[PDB]
Structure 1
Amino acid sequence: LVPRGSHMVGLIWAQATSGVIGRGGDIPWRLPEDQAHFREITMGHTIVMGRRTWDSLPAKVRPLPGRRNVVLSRQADFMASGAEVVGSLEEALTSPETWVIGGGQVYALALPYATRCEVTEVDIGLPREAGDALAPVLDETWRGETGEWRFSRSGLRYRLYSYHRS
């Protein structure tokens, strides 16, 4: 349960088996089951994203519906129509339950405050290239549940992980 006086922080991402989450301003695969899962978990909560993740959303789609959208930027003139731009996690994490939805920089930034990670891993062979955005590495304080490999309508294997810590 999430008490309303708390500030729970979760991270949610989809990665290739290499840990790649982003390349060239996009995600280098498509998996409908991951889109459905991401929406099931985040719906109704505040979502926090880095400015480059906001940029990666088509203008017509953003802000993402059904969730309070918060974007992190250090640029005083960056504006996100329909959403709030703040300069720090201190300002972004005021809700009782917040999902950090990427990208690579913001996962690393939020990791010290997070107590849950929800991961989709896609069995697509995409080795890491310079400039890629990557999933955060999780130390031994994080305890994980790994699901069995499942198979997408799109013909890719995928599996879910849930990590927690105190």
Structure 2
Amino acid sequence: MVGLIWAQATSGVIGRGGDIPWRLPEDQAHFREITMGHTIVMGRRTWDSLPAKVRPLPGRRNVVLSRQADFMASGAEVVGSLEEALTSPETWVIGGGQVYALALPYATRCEVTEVDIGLPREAGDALAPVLDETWRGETGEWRFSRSGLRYRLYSYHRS
């Protein structure tokens, strides 16, 4: 089982400036619940975006994708292809835009959080992959976060 998990603004923006341009505490708990105990796969830039105290993410098999054959990430496995990182019972690809687009052809689930902020897409932004006709999803209802922002969960799956 290869899943993808991300939070996006409605526009599809997931990253900007090596950061996520919002903070949604509920989503962080949701991400932790979904990924805990499993293999997580991330691009090197997303690994870099994790503060030193959060890397590696506890209780998960942290795997980092990099074209750098020398690259070493303290607390994660560094591999040079996605298939190298996809050795699993359950793997969650956790970002960023590049690695999501690389991983979607091998994914059966996407756990999407949509953040209701009018964040327009800007050149250089990391974007969410757009899910086509093969993706069947169920919409969650709007929720309000402690952060003040409105958000809702999507659970996408394909057979």
Give the TM-score taking structure 1 as reference length: 0.94
**Whole-angstrom distance in 1 between the partners of 2:104 and 2:24:** 25
Moved over 2 A (4+): none
- Tell me the CA shift for residue 116 of structure 1: 0.2
1:73 aligns with 2:66: yes
- Tell me the CA shift for residue 77 of structure 1: 1.9
- Tell me the CA shift for residue 69 of structure 1: 0.2
- Tell me the CA shift for residue 82 of structure 1: 1.3
Per-residue Cα deviation, 1:11-43 (whole angstroms, up to 9, x for no partner): 000000111000000000000001000001000
**Whole-angstrom distance in 1 between the partners of 2:56 and 2:106:** 24
**Whole-angstrom distance in 2 between the partners of 1:13 and 1:112:** 16
**Whole-angstrom distance in 2 between the partners of 1:145 and 1:51:** 31
- Tell me the CA shift for residue 58 of structure 1: 1.1
Per-residue Cα deviation, 1:98-142 (whole angstroms, up to 9, x for no partner): 000000000000000100000011101110000000000101000
* Counterpart position of 1:109: 102
* Counterpart position of 2:25: 32
- Tell me the CA shift for residue 60 of structure 1: 2.4
**Whole-angstrom distance in 2 between the partners of 1:129 and 1:144:** 27
- Tell me the CA shift for residue 96 of structure 1: 0.8
Q: Provide the identity percentage.
A: 100
**Whole-angstrom distance in 2 between the partners of 1:106 and 1:25:** 14
Which moved further from structure 2: 136-145 or 56-65? 56-65
SS at 1:60 equivalent: helix
Structure 1: runs of 5 or more not aligned: 1-7
SS at 1:144 equivalent: strand
**Whole-angstrom distance in 1 between the partners of 2:141 and 2:68:** 42
SS at 2:148 equivalent: coil
**Whole-angstrom distance in 2 between the partners of 1:52 and 1:59:** 13
Per-residue Cα deviation, 1:31-72 (whole angstroms, up to 9, x for no partner): 000100000100000000000000001122201101000000
SS at 1:130 equivalent: coil
* Counterpart position of 2:37: 44
